[PDB]
Amino acid sequence: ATSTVTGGYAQSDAQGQMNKMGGFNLKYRYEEDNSPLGVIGSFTYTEKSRTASSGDYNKNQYYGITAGPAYRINDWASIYGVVGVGYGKFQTTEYPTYKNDTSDYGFSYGAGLQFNPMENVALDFSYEQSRIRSVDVGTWIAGVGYRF
């Protein structure tokens, strides 16, 4: 039950203050009075690691595909439902075929807590956490778009 372009910044500091950047969360949908089901597409990248020497950290980027229906309900309080899982062949790249091979399920999702607009602004509060073996990240979404 949305229809606007949102975005901001997501800071990351894991491994003991040794990471920066991340990407922008883009949300765009269109479902209202027609069918209690839409297509929530979220394509974002993860600015983590990098190979600027001889690949001694990690390779490939992160890919997440979130999805969920549209249910407003309540007097006028939307509900959260943005689940996501991470996976791929990336973790160790500095040997003749070593990799890690630690098939795990990532927990990517936020909560619903949107306030009413005052003049022309709609801030969203969604908490994102990771669980890659042992990584701690504390991002603070600062969306600054419209609301529909």
UniProtKB/Swiss-Prot annotation:
Cited SUPFAM superfamilies: OMPA-like
Extracellular side stretches: 13-21, 47-62, 87-106, 131-137
Alphabetically ordered keywords of this record: Cell outer membrane, Membrane, Signal, Transmembrane, Transmembrane beta strand
Coiled-coil spans in chain: none
Keyword hit for Signal: yes
Cysteine-cysteine disulfides: none
GO cellular component terms, A-Z: cell outer membrane; host outer membrane
Ranges annotated as spanning the membrane: 3-12, 22-31, 37-46, 63-72, 77-86, 107-116, 121-130, 138-147
Periplasmic domain ranges by topology: 1-2, 32-36, 73-76, 117-120, 148
Compartments in which it is found: Cell outer membrane
Topological relation to the membrane, as annotated: Multi-pass membrane protein
NCBIfam families, A to Z: PRK09408.1
Family indicated by similarity: Belongs to the outer membrane OOP (TC 1.B.6) superfamily. OmpX family.
Protein name per UniProt: Outer membrane protein X
Organism: Escherichia coli (strain K12)
Organism ancestry: Bacteria, Pseudomonadati, Pseudomonadota, Gammaproteobacteria, Enterobacterales
